[PDB]
Amino acid sequence: GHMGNAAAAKKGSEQESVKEFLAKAKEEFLKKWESPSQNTAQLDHFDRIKTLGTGSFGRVMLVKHKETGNHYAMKILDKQKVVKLKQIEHTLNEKRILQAVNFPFLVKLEFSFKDNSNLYMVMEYVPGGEMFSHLRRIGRFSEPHARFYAAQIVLTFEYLHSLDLIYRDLKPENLLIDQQGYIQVTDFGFAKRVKGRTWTLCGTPEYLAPEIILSKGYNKAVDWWALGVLIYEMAAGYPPFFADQPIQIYEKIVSGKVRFPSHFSSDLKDLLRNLLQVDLTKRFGNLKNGVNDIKNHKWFATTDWIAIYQRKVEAPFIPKFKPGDTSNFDDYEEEEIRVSINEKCGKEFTEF
């Protein structure tokens, strides 16, 4: 066989220890999921510094806590705009997930609160900015560098899926790099508690699994497809399926054909063919052996999963350290934060 007695016993023990960790982590998650934290700071505790990102319903700003001097990233959502754009459930769900999860590669919600006009989520500030910018600048990551990031996503999805959470938003734009070179996942606006199947068309074209495109009910295996897309794009510098228009992207995704750069190792191509598998009965992460088919793949043979979790592996890349430096985020026009004398949409946001 592939393993002698010592190696097989070690692997079996490791896999049983994962089950034990996940059972405890579920218990902790469910307590916070059923009794969420609310109203843990207020706006005048913070000085606003600068905008790190903007969207249709709000913005993320660097702020400084006046007493500690600590910097945070504050997501500000205009209650009236959230209602108008039909994002009440997504907004409440994102905050409920963030306050309940706990994992070293998931961003931490330090405070949350609301006022007459806005909802506020105060999260850790992650000064390395988005993986996206680093990837486009460097061009592509070497296989060991891509693997270091991929291993963190594998463990994060193993954790989230144990909680029956599907993520549905994986892409370099949604992965931040911290000062130690490790990944932080921040956006939970498309995540959903799903024990079985779900049906919403959501995600980003390049990262959509075929079953989403084909308007099927789908499950957590869409996240493993997305992992394949991410690994490919990290190692190649471009994603496996692209075109001028989304419809042409979708034709490629559903086709069952993927092509690889000549510098990809055979081990990498084998992993990617098993992740980017259209046939759900064959896709890694969706078989009887679950996440272990991925973690035990030859491409990950050098990965010490516990050392990654414990953050004891030396990262391949440390973003330039300039603690409130914003250099790894884009520049945006600074608009004011207005708070009305009258409470807006109170009933809709009671749970926030």
């Binding site: 996206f132 486009r136 938003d169 892409k171 734009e173 498309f190 068309l201 959501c202 995600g203 980003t204 074209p205 390049e206 959509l208 510098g237 471009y238 692209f242 075109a243 001028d244 989304p246 092509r259 750069p261």
Partner: peptide, 18 residues
């Protein structure tokens, strides 16, 4: 080349969700 095709796609910047 594939890289040139990627540039030609116009989808090298940050991608929006559907």
């Amino acid at each position: 080349t594939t890289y040139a095709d990627f540039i030609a796609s116009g989808r090298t910047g940050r991608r929006n969700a559907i």
